[PDB]
Amino acid sequence: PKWYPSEDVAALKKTRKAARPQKLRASLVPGTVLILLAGRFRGKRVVYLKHLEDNTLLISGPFKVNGVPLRRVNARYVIATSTKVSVEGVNVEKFNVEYFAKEEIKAERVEDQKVVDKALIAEIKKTPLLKQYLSASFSLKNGDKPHMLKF
Amino acid sequence: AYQKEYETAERNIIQAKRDAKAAGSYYVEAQHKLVFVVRIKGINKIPPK
Amino acid sequence: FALPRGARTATVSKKWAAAAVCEKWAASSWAKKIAQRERRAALTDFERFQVMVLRKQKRYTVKKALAK
Amino acid sequence: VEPVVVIDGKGHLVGRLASVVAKQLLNGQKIVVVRAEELNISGEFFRNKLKYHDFLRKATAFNKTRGPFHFRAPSRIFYKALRGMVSHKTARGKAALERLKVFEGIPPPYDKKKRVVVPQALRVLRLKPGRKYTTLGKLSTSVGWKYEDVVAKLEAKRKVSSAEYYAKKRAFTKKVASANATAAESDVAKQLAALGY
Amino acid sequence: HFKEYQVIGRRLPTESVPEPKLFRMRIFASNEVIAKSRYWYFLQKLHKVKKASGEIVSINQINEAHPTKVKNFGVWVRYDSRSGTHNMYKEIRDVSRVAAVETLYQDMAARHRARFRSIHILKVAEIEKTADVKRQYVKQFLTKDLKFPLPHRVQKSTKTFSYKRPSTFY
Amino acid sequence: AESHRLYVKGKHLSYQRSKRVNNPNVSLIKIEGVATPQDAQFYLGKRIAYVYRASKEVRGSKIRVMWGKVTRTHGNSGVVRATFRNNLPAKTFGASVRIFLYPSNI
RNA sequence: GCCCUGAGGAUGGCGCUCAAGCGUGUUACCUAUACUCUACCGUCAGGGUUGAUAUGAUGCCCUGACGAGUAGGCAGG
RNA sequence: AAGCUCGUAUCAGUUUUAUGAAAAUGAAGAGCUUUUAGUGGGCCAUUUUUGGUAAGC
RNA sequence: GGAAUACUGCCAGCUGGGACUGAGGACUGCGACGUAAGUCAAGGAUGCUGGCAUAAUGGUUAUAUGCCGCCCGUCUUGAAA
């Protein structure tokens, strides 16, 4: 701005902290079935699609299966399971950080969700009981030891 | 140079020990020359000396 | 199983192979229980859901069979 | 693990059982002790009887009632043993004691509910074989308890019709096992077996 | 865990006496420093050599020839207690010399209340044939076709409460 | 449906204390199903929430929650130290507490 | 070597007997104002500072250690 | 507390060595006039003792 | 005859789980990557996200409770008393 500082404020020293890309854990791979832990969709099994530039995971229910739409979920608040579903046949490059900006549901968002669900339904049906497993929610029971259970 | 000297010294010591064992004659180990001392007790109730 | 006193490793292994104690061990309910516990500890969430569905089906079949 | 735990005090050590019950109480766990009269204490009977006398011989001169209180019921003895292991005279200690109940035998509705035992407090698991031991019920009867006869009489009735309940349960499990067997070798059963079930 | 060490000293050879008697003995200790200290103490006691004019020619560790062979060990031990010092002999059925000496030390600290401070291992030897053992409790395990049970096993519990009423059968 | 629990229930034993001195800033929490420090190592860093009912309604609800984190193991019985934003009332000794699975690493 | 005799109270109590008693050896864990690293107040010691300071050179800063204490002394409020 | 001469070779609740006087470690905060508050209570305990017999004392 | 393993010590070897600290304030220096331009974990943290004006949050009284704390001043005797 044209305005010279009206008061003396010490300038910040040259910081040296590069914005290195996130080093995601090995367990998190595209197409892996994820389980939500906290939030409005806590305990709802979801699928992993793409890693966003804002250190967040793009996850789809799919919406037609359990009602979970394309949402951004932090990696640390997700449990990665060994099960995986083919994702090469689903287009995810379109989604980005600006896609989820918020400047009565956007029509484009619904259309993208419909396309993603159509693409991923065949892969989900490729294995028996996978759709039912995704629809079913995840909860703990007596005698369950998370440090002993295998995911 | 210092790393090479240390490696040569340790190799020579080991070789001398092995040769002494093979020859049946006792080895004359070099006397220690450096020791590190660490205080254990506190700074109270210690006799003056 | 029979074993000479103070047998060496080779003789012990030979006698173990001859007696086939491994086959008897597996058939016993103790080894089967160990294997079942290991398999349960090795189960996965999707495998757990499949087990739940199969258990529900088996329970339905058993209840249908019962009282008849 | 369980909202309320019913511990079978038969064949158990007073010390270890009381210590574990108090520790669980301090952790916020409700515990009910049954069959107190069957509780056992290490050592020969005379030693235990002599020990009891020397703690009640200290009756206060000016006020005996306000002083030491000598209770003869086995449940009261167990409570006294456990009371000293808890920080009484404090709100935290007083609240914890509220979670513990001690009864002679198994009065209802606990008689119709599952009961557990403490492996580390079993007399047959800690005491060396062949060593003398004392029974809490006999000691209580010797020191003044007068309800041993009725306790045994109505505990025998407890086993009565409970043997019949177990027989009915065994008969039901016979049919359950038959149904499981005839349902075996099926596709669902084979899949369950492969999946560890 | 004990260990076997060999220590030799020849009292700092001087003029007119090259290569002295070169006293040799085997010392059991948990580390080299303790072995050297015990060797010095033994030299001072039994012999007239002290660390003032002493010298440690070399210290080596001896490994048992057959760590997987059962042997009967005869140990001659001289130990001191509240009363006067006296000799002692014991027989141990162990696999290795180190284990035998460790068991002997444990027994001495248990029965006779004698600890490592006042215990000397004079000699450790292996009994070759039977009927040479002079201790009944060692002969007990030499009987042909020895079979015995393990009644009243002390099963360990991983939980405070167990709904099983466990049995100690074996 | 039957159960919606996504946390491991535990018990608050007492603050880190000596024979005659206590440090309320650190609380000891017992986790069900944990018996050794190795097992408790998995729970390190997990959020701890204490749920209790309040007489007054402030934010449209009668439930007030205090959050915390798991710091390090304690003892050989699986006890794990925990630090909260605000220390526990000290009346919750033996009270039930909730340990969540996030932030998760598995 | 252990046990018995051998001459209103407390191993603290609760209590314990292959001990939760005794002797020995190894690991596992708790902490004090004790010790290691770092945030801050002050004392000391050293140092930088002006063809004037992007704040009263009695100003603004860098470096290391130290900080118990009765009477008494000095210093700043 | 002020002054002067100063950082050293001024020294050590240390060790060896020597003679029967030369090195190690650490500190360079060390040397000489003037005066200026307070301070001459003792307990515990090893060794000598002051010597001894139930013991102390 | 032959290797392997146990133990000791080294790695200016590699790589995960957890906790506190973010101190300095435009560059001057030691260093690394890179043929170079330039970059860097190199004399102290940066970027993004979620909660907020009938806010977020913070402050006082008692009770709710984990633990500790002898009644103050002067004077005796080496001390407490």
Write the DSSP string, B15-47. Answer: HHHHHHHHHTPPP-PPPP--------S-SSS--
- Identify whether the C-beta of residue E60 lies closer than 8 Å to the C-beta of residue E3: no
Domain ranges of chain F: 1-106
Strand partners, F105: none
Instruction: Tell me how far apart the alpha carbons of residues C40 and C52 are, in angstroms, rounded to a whole number.
Output: 13
Domains of chain D with CATH codes: 1-147 (3.90.1180.10), 148-197 (1.20.5.4280)
Give the protein-side footprint of strand H (Cβ within 7 Å): B 48-49
- Contact of E58 with chain B, judged by CB distance below 8 Å, is answered with yes
- Contact of E157 with chain D, judged by CB distance below 8 Å, is answered with yes
- Identify whether the C-beta of residue D126 lies closer than 8 Å to the C-beta of residue D120: yes
Provide the 10 A C-beta neighbour count for residue B49. 3
Give the CA angle between residues E29, E34, E36 to the nearest 5°: 105
Q: Is the CB of E69 under 7 A from strand G?
A: no
Give chain C's largest Cα–Cα span. 61
Data resolution in angstroms = 3.5
Tokens (6 digits) for F43: 């729970």
- Identify whether the C-beta of residue D119 lies closer than 8 Å to the C-beta of residue E162: yes
Closest CA to D33 of D100, D83, D88, D90: D100
Instruction: Tell me how far apart the alpha carbons of residues A127 and D28 are, in angstroms, rounded to a whole number.
Output: 47
Sheet strand arrangement including A57-60: A71-73, A57-60, A45-51, A32-36, A78-84
Give the technique used to solve this structure: cryo-EM
Please report residues of C whose CB lies closer than 8 A to that of D188: 54, 57-58, 61
Quickly tell me which residue has 């009961």 as its tokens.
Answer: D115
Domain F1-106, CATH class in plain words:
mainly beta
**Is residue D168 classed as helix, strand or coil in its secondary structure?**
helix
Residue B27 CA to its chain's centroid (Å): 14
E36 Cβ contact list (under 8 Å, min separation 6): E7, E56, E59
Task: Give the E window 78-137 contacts with B, CB below 8 Å.
Answer: none
Instruction: Tell me how far apart the alpha carbons of residues A143 and F15 are, in angstroms, rounded to a whole number.
Output: 27
Alpha carbon distances (Å) from A104 to A107, A109, A112? 9, 11, 16
Sheet strand arrangement including D30-34: D4-8, D30-34, D100-102
Q: How far is E58 from chain B (nearest CA, A)?
A: 7
Residue B44 (CA) to nucleotide H36 (C1'), in angstroms, measures 33
Closest CA to D96 of A114, B9, E140, F94: F94
Instruction: Tell me how far apart the alpha carbons of residues F49 and F82 are, in angstroms, rounded to a whole number.
Output: 11
Which helix (H) or strand (E) element contains residue B4? helix B2-23
Chain H footprint bases within 7 A of protein beta carbons: 13-15
Instruction: Please tell me the number of Cα atoms within 13 Å of E68 on its side-chain side.
Output: 4
Sign of CA dihedral C42, C44, C47, C51: positive
CA dihedral E72, E78, E82, E83 (to 10 degrees): 110
Domain ranges of chain A: 1-151
Q: Nucleic chain I: which protein residues 175-194 of D have CB below 7 A from it?
A: none
Instruction: Tell me how far apart the alpha carbons of residues F66 and F91 are, in angstroms, rounded to a whole number.
Output: 14
Quickly tell me which residue has 């339904």 as its tokens.
Answer: A121
What is the separation, in whole angstroms, between the first and last Cα of chain E? 31
Quickly tell me which residue has 């766990």 as its tokens.
Answer: D29
Domains of chain E with CATH codes: 1-67 (3.10.20.10), 68-144 (3.10.20.10)
Closest CA to E107 of E77, E67, E148: E77
Q: Decide the pairing of beta strands F7-17 and F96-100.
A: antiparallel
